[PDB]
Design a protein around this motif. Sequence first.
Motif, short mmCIF file in Angstrom:
data_model
loop_
_atom_site.label_atom_id
_atom_site.label_comp_id
_atom_site.label_asym_id
_atom_site.label_seq_id
_atom_site.Cartn_x
_atom_site.Cartn_y
_atom_site.Cartn_z
N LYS D 44 0.82 -1.21 0.00
CA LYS D 44 0.00 0.00 0.00
C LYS D 44 0.86 1.26 0.00
CE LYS D 44 -4.51 -1.27 1.82
NZ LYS D 44 -5.37 -0.22 1.24
N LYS D 46 3.97 1.57 -1.47
CA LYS D 46 4.39 1.73 -2.85
C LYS D 46 3.24 2.18 -3.74
CE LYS D 46 4.46 -1.22 -6.00
NZ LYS D 46 4.59 -2.58 -6.60
N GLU D 47 2.01 1.88 -3.35
CA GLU D 47 0.87 2.41 -4.08
C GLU D 47 0.71 3.91 -3.86
OE1 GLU D 47 -1.06 1.49 -6.31
OE2 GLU D 47 -2.39 3.24 -6.24
N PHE D 49 3.04 5.85 -3.36
CA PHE D 49 4.17 6.51 -4.00
C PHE D 49 3.89 6.92 -5.44
CE2 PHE D 49 8.54 6.24 -5.91
CZ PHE D 49 8.88 7.50 -5.48
N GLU D 50 2.86 6.37 -6.07
CA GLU D 50 2.56 6.68 -7.47
C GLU D 50 1.08 6.93 -7.65
OE1 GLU D 50 4.37 3.44 -9.40
OE2 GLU D 50 3.14 1.91 -8.43
N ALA D 51 0.50 7.76 -6.80
CA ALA D 51 -0.93 8.03 -6.84
C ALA D 51 -1.28 9.48 -7.11
CB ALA D 51 -1.59 7.61 -5.52
N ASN D 54 -2.56 11.32 -3.22
CA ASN D 54 -2.43 10.72 -1.89
C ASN D 54 -3.14 11.47 -0.77
OD1 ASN D 54 -0.07 12.45 -0.42
ND2 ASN D 54 0.31 12.27 -2.62
N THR D 56 -6.46 10.27 -0.54
CA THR D 56 -7.22 9.07 -0.26
C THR D 56 -6.34 7.84 -0.15
OG1 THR D 56 -9.02 7.66 -0.99
CG2 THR D 56 -7.60 8.59 -2.65
N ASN D 60 -6.32 5.38 3.45
CA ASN D 60 -6.37 3.92 3.45
C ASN D 60 -5.31 3.34 4.36
OD1 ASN D 60 -8.33 4.29 1.61
ND2 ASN D 60 -7.44 2.96 0.05
#
Lengths: 49, 115, 115, 98, 48
Positions: D44, D46-47, D49-51, D54, D56, D60
Amino acid sequence: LSGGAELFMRRASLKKEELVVHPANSPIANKNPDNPKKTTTLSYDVYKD
Amino acid sequence: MYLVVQALIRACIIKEIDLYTEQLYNIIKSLPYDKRPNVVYSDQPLDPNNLDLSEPELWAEQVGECMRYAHNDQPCFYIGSTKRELRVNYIVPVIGVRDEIERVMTLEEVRNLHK
Amino acid sequence: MYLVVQALIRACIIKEIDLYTEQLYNIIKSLPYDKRPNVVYSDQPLDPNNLDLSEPELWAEQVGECMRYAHNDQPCFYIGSTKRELRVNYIVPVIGVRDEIERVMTLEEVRNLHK
Amino acid sequence: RNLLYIVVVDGKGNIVEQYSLNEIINNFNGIRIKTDYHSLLDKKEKERFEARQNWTSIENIKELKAGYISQVVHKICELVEKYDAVIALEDLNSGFKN
Amino acid sequence: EKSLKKNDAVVAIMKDLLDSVKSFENYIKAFFGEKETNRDESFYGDFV
RNA sequence: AAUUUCUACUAAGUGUAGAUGGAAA
Ligand SMILES: [Mg+2]
């Protein structure tokens, strides 16, 4: 039972044109890698939310 | 005149993109979540032939659970983890890391991605 | 003139039938062989809306294993038992018994056929 | 490298038991299935890191963590019953976490 | 163009903006000294 | 991805494992 219960209602917040669902018999995937069984096939529907 | 054809070929494109998505979402529905490819989400159909990757308004994240709508059977997707609620309808795989997208990944490579 | 449009809408029909087949062959690929529905095979695309069922050159058998081609990914089917080698490309379900076809079975009934 | 590490000592200073809690092991119907919670958090992150925004993808994680300190409460109120022991918690008023 | 929740350009930009502004507000807040003796009221006036 | 609700799920098939103090502001 410490008396004084109540009863609430909450409307359906999702519009029925938005529901999402894994259809029947569609072999779903499983997210946790330690679980050995890597798929799943329910014989009904899984209505998200 | 010439504005009933070029207002109809823009239905041939939609009816081809629906087929492309139907053909993809049936192979994202098998890969284990830690291998699904970096996609370029958007809520309007994407021609995965040209796609003008130098566009500035399209990212490249990883694609989560590929569910399917309720009333019709449109194959809606889910970007990243699910609880972001980033329900996008059309996607297209890219070998692109987060933003500096490199190229569009052909279908058979997305299928060959399982290994 | 008028013979480039009505020689193009006959590509919108093909690109819609491919989507219909792609959407069916992904639900014939799940039913257990003893429930798959009676289909109307043919090697040319079939518009499952009209289909002019009173046509005399189309039967209604049971559909066997729904495989998938090798070079492209066209979803070829197999009528009856396999060893008949009756490889047909497009199909359409019908509630019709062998020849006296009654109507065309909607998609969601073919999906609801599993039970 | 561990979200929470547990050791439980005797009255004399022996390591009676030690392990990490990156792997909460749900124990159902006799057959146990272990479900990681650090690999999950790393995915999550690393997710995030490329959103690209961030707000939302940062809620999470603040919910997953607060959903991981509600499945360690059991692996602690298990040890306490099993050993009739006391618990030792860092006092945050005087800490400098790195 | 889209639903704001799904949309990002109208949220990523919003964040890039509010974050910098709030960082400035958080950085300048220090210049109070919390309730003292004489201070440059010519400064603190406009400051507050 | 089904939940009084949250989290992780699919957990042997309309669910499994934990946790949960709500109403007001
Ligand atoms: Mg959940």
